[PDB]
Amino acid sequence: QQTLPVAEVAQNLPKKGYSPFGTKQSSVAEWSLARLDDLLNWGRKGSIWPLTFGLACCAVEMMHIAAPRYDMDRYGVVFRASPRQADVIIVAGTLTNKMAPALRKVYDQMPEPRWVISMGSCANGGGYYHYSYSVVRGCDRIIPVDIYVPGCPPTAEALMYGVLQLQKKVKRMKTLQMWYRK
Amino acid sequence: EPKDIVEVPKGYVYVNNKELSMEFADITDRAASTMFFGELLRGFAVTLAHIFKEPATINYPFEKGPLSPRFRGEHALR
Amino acid sequence: ELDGETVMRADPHIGLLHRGTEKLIEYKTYTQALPYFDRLDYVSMMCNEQCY
Amino acid sequence: MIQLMLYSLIITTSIIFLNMIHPLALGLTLLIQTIFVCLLTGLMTKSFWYSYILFLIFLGGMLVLFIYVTSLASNEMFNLSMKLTLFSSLILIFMLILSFIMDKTSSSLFLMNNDMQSIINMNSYFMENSLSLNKLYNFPTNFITILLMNYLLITLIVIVKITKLFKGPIRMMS
Amino acid sequence: MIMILYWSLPMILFILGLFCFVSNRKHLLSMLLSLEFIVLMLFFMLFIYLNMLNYESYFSMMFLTFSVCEGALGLSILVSMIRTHGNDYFQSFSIM
Amino acid sequence: KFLGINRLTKLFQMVREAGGLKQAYLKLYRNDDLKIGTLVGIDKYGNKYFENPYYFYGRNRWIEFAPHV
Amino acid sequence: MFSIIFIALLILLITTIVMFLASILSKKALIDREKSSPFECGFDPKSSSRLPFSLRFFLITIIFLIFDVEIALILPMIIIMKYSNIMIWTITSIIFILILLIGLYHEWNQGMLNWSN
Amino acid sequence: MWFEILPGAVIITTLLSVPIYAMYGLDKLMIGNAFRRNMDERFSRVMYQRDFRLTDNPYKMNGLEQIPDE
Amino acid sequence: FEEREKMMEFYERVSGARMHAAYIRPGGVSLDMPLGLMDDIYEFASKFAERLDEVEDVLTTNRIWVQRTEDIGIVTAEEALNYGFSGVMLRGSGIKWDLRKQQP
Amino acid sequence: IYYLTAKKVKRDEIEMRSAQNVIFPILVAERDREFLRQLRRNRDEEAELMK
Amino acid sequence: MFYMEFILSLIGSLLLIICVLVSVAFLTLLERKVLGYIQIRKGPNKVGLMGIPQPFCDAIKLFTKEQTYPLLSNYLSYYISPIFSLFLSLFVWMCMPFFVKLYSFNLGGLFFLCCTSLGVYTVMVAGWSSNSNYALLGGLRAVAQTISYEVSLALILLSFIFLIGSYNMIYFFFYQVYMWFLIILFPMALVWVSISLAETNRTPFDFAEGESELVSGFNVEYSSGGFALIFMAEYASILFMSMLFCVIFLGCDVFNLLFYMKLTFISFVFIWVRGTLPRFRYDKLMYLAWKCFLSFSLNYLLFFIGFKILLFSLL
Ligand SMILES: COC1=C(OC)C(=O)C(C/C=C(\C)CC/C=C(\C)CC/C=C(\C)CC/C=C(\C)CC/C=C(/C)CC/C=C(\C)CC/C=C(\C)CC/C=C(\C)CC/C=C(\C)CCC=C(C)C)=C(C)C1=O
Ligand SMILES: CCCCCCCCCCCCCCCCCC(=O)OC[C@H](COP(=O)([O-])OCC[N+](C)(C)C)OC(=O)CCCCCCCCCCCCCCCCC
Ligand SMILES: CCCCCCCCCCCCCCCCCC(=O)OC[C@H](COP(=O)(O)OCCN)OC(=O)CCCCCCCCCCCCCCCCC
Ligand SMILES: CCCCCCCCCC(=O)OC[C@H](COP(=O)(O)OCCC(C)C)OC(=O)CCCCCCC
Ligand code: SF4
């Protein structure tokens, strides 16, 4: 555990910059691949397209980032009906026994790269229906999850916190530098 | 005024209960609104008016929505 | 079941959001069974709390 | 050079059209056939009107025929063959070589274009599709146009009579 | 030679279209498409004849109209097959 | 001038208060809206809290974050 | 028209280079068994889309074809007005449009412009 | 508020104004005439044949200096 | 949904959760309403009539909405009674039945 | 207003047609002189080639 | 023909293609900004400076996501159809009336009708070849849509042509030197706006790509480049019919910036109709374009035939 720095210490530190991979990497090819990766992650963290999925009550909150108080289209985020035209599936609601192959098929038909936001307590770990017969204990055991939005109804502030943390995860996602070091 | 098909009781409201007027003035009014798109132009006018409104968006995370002191969030042990 | 664009036989399949709610209400206290009814009906909630 | 290329493409697409079992292969082959036939017809006339008219006709016709493809013989197997691809490629390269080594004055069409007509022709200086389409609406042959209006009305009456709309929709095993 | 260098080609393509029209195909709609192809090549040959003459190309739309009404007759016959049969197989129709 | 030229004057006042054209460009790049308001507070970690009641409720009080991030 | 052929071939070439550049720069992941399957709203299809489709507007399509070749005879008379007899041109034009109105209103009266159902 | 729509519209207004006005420069660089000769009518095409017969540049004009003194 | 988010803000003000309030309990309510909720609810209810007037000006009079809604899905009243309908689907078919008035 | 506009367009078209009619005789005179010269050249070349 | 021409025709056509493509990208930005402002919410503001490089975010992502290799499809016909859709949607833009001689299209209306008929051919080929039920339903809805609006689009065009007397769209400029044709043709300003939305598959006539009736229409199996070229083909069609609304109904001048301001305004109108009116059914579309639009087109064609005979005797 570390805390946020004091303003004198914060004035001592320099600016972080946009690039999470640093300014220089002591090679021309490494710098070129890092800047290409920065451009690619800027194009990917800008306008992730979530999927019209909406299993349950947490979905009603999902329209409160559609609703003009929070405005998910300001961030590039915009809903698409088909899973082929989507980067993100927001698994939000109760995942039951009949929806296990449905969610697995919709996730598998969605093309790479794939990031899944788990919104709500039922999608995280079953929640208030954890000890029931029909509810799958979270959506981790069927599909991978990158972001766990924790509130049962999350505030749309807390859902866009998960969306912005997904954007920061895509911003730190590195593939071309990995290709150079593989 | 258009007539009523079924007489309403006290304390009840009937929707889609008015008979369409068969006089020439109302038929010409609905005909002009048909071929000249009167309600379409009214809806376009309302929409163009709400283009000029102020947005209700808040600049997250610099601007955060209103809350209450009773708000339920992360559990904590005092 | 469609002949063209028009329907011939529309059969709804449900239970896709079946959570075993009533069997779970059988295992809780009435105060604990009260937040179930917020999750029966999704977009009217204080009505369901009023009914319970 | 372009006319001989259109000759070679029309020959190759006609060989392809004679060999296709599947209706959609015939539809795409006659799409590119009517494209090449529309360009070739244009070369012969002073103006480019009837190529455009024939293209609206043959795009208004096969638009309906695809609906009958999806209603009747929707499920039929495509079979690509290497022999047809090799034959079409060899004949196409052979006719492009033969068209390149040919004298193009002898192989050109003798039909007169808008610039092949002489300067002394005062009828060539008018608007380009006026005197060609004039006789549709002139006195000796307006009655043939009258006959065509009545013929199209009788055609529509025939279509309504022998496609009974009240018997229901059409499909396989109706 | 003159008949060979000019307009010998659409006779060959019309013969190929006629052989496509009468070939043993499973469906009637392939024969309708072969009819559309022989309309195209008859349009080519009629267009060569009407473009030797100067201002007689107005007839080239009338042939289009009679050919489209032929195609509409064939399409309505294809509808009327469904009123009696369940299919458009040429083997399914009566040989006598 | 009844069409909003005083709002252009307020925009120029916003530009001069931001610290220059380059500083206003940097503030408009970091914070997606350019706004004016009275400085209420400065939290230990270096963030600044502004409040202006002229705006819509929800945009009255905002935070400008620390310049080192 | 020779320039239109060359620029149409250039547009086709440019679009094929654009699609091949989209295919080359695409992410190359391994093909899963159920990734390639048709969507069908997340479940098994029960039927292929090559199953025969019911046509409820066959009469409307053939009337569309007949009316389109009727369109092919209207398009000349823009040019023909300045170069012909005015009397014959008006008799042909008003008689053409009135015969089309008789045919369209007669099939509206029969209800043949309504879909079979 | 509503003025932010105008960024993103003027770019559609400017860039679609590009392929006309640029040719109004790009003809003047090499043709010398900002309007290249139209070929809608047959007479304009025949007189274009006459200009391209007289000079290799059809947009170079033969004035009265061509005419000999007599 | 701008107004709907205002009402979930009201829900968060009275109970502490935006949607699932857990507020109405057996034996009354859990908590008293906070001070100043009257002015907020009153201002919202004053503006909501004009918001509904704008929404009805867009949706109700339009020919496309009428052609997409009218004479579509007609349910008879004896089918409504025999199939156990309740609420608006009873009230839309001419049956005068509201549970807030008959059994209050 | 369209009738007035059609009057203006007809005036411009009639002026262009008058310019065409006054330019054409010089062009057709040059055409027939070059046509007779090329016919003489073609008759000489056919006699030279087919000897 | 002079050599320099061919070079300048090639250069102007390529510059027009590039500018129409970048204007398609900024048209997506314009729709995503004002269509938000149709409602209360804002457009894209965070990415880039003020949302200006947001179509670059949308284009970098779609050119890098994984290409779908679908199972039951005919892939050799599935790969080629968006290429031909973008090819005809950019090939129709050669019909643009330039005051310089870009191309001497004497038959521009027939060229427009040919490319209009061919774009829906690419749509219905892409719908069939995906081998999905929603894709086939969107394709058949597109075929029913074009069978609905095609003859109505042609006859309405003829009425405008009668006011011109020629098929060359630059002759629209000489007949609009005193006033625009919006004064005369206001009922077909409404009717041509109705047809132009059915041409571009846009709301209220959005049956080829439905988000609630179907699932994305015929675009259900297209992803990461096929969807991109389909989407640019649709939006270039939107730009082309916005241009044709500015040519016929408004001033046909191209040396004024007011023409491109009007084209941006008609594109804003195209976004504006989508953000207000609900979608039809294509049953009601077929009952509209066959019994109302076609009858009104024939009747007002009779009105223009009589008016052109009346005008010709006075001249
Ligand atoms: C009550 O019950 C219910 C539930 O239970 C509770 C539910 O849960 C649900 C489910 C609902 C939810 C889960 C949430 C609710 C859903 C919504 C609110 C969705 C509705 C909102 C929308 C549809 C958004 C509004 C629409 C808009 C803004 C239209 C635009 C949208 C887009 C996606 C367009 C963006 C796409 C783009 C831009 C494609 C990208 C392509 C490009 C950018 C290409 C362009 C290229 C260039 C510009 C450059 C290229 C240049 C080139 C190639 C040449 C250059 C060459 C050079 C040399 C320079 C429902 C319905 C329900 O009822
Ligand atoms: C700055 C510009 C702002 C405005 C921009 C937008 C412009 C307006 C909207 C453009 C189009 C919007 C999208 C498409 C909407 C389509 C709506 C539609 O058609 O709905 C179907 C509806 C259907 O009508 P309905 O809604 O009445 O339906 C009941 C009737 N049945 C069922 C029988 C059809 O409307 C119409 O079809 C109306 C007619 C449209 C065509 C106009 C005909 C005019 C006829 C000539 C008038 C002559 C007057 C008298 C002259 C006398 C001379 C002596
Ligand atoms: C008007 C009607 C006209 C009709 C006729 C039109 C004819 C057009 C020409 C047709 C030519 C056909 C050639 C087909 C070759 C490929 C055949 C094929 O099917 O390939 C399959 C392959 C992967 O697909 P698969 O794994 O089979 O998945 C399907 C499973 N259901 O598929 C693929 O990999 C997709 C294709 C990728 C192609 C990449 C080519 C290599 C790169 C070329 C250079 C690009 C340069 C870019 C940058 C340039 C910069 C200047
Ligand atoms: C791949 C082809 C897709 C289909 C294109 C259809 C074009 C319209 C139909 C037609 O015949 O138009 C005649 C027109 C005739 O030209 P225009 O009369 O339009 O213009 C005169 C021409 C330089 C004065 C304007 O030709 C074309 O459109 C060329 C088509 C090129 C096709 C290239 C590939 C073979
Ligand atoms: S996590 Fe809470 S709000 Fe979300 S679906 Fe489950 S019970 Fe409903």
Author numbering:
A (entry chain S7): 40 to 221
B (entry chain S8): 32 to 109
C (entry chain S2): 105 to 156
D (entry chain 6): 1 to 174
E (entry chain 4L): 1 to 96
F (entry chain AN): 3 to 71
G (entry chain 3): 1 to 117
H (entry chain A1): 1 to 70
Paper passage:
We identify a helix-locked state in which an N-terminal α-helix on the NDUFS4 subunit wedges between the peripheral and membrane arms. The name helix-locked state refers to the fact that the positions of the PA and MA are ‘locked’ relative to each other due to the presence of the NDUFS4 helix. Once the PA and MA are positioned such that they are far enough apart to accommodate the NDUFS4 helix, the binding of the helix ‘locks’ their relative positions. In the helix-locked state, the interaction between NDUFA5 and NDUFA10 is mediated in part by the N-terminus of NDUFS4 which binds along the surface of NDUFA10; and D34S4 forms a salt bridge with R92A5. In the helix-locked state, the C-terminal loop of NDUFA9 binds atop the TMH1-2ND3 loop, trapping R50ND3 to the surface of ND1, thereby holding the loop in place like a latch. In the helix-locked state, multiple hydrogen bonding and salt bridging interactions were seen between the TMH1-2ND3 loop and ND1. First, in the helix-locked state, the angle between the PA and MA is not consistent with either the open states of Y. lipolytica or mammalian CIs but the active site loops are fully ordered and buried by the NDUFA9 latch. This state also lacks the TMH3ND6 π-bulge indicating that the water wire of the hydrophilic access is intact, though a higher resolution structure is needed to confirm this. The presence of the NDUFA9 latch holding the TMH1-2ND3 loop down in the helix-locked state may block conformational changes in TMH1-2ND3, suggesting that it is a resting state incapable of turnover.
Respiratory complex I is a proton-pumping oxidoreductase key to bioenergetic metabolism. CI couples the transfer of electrons from NADH to CoQ to the pumping of four H+ across the IMM. It has an ‘L’ shaped structure consisting of two arms: a peripheral arm (PA) that extends into the matrix and a membrane arm (MA) that is embedded in the IMM. Our Dm-CI structure contained the 14 core subunits as well as 29 accessory subunits, for a total composition of 43 subunits, two fewer than the 45 total subunits observed in mammals.
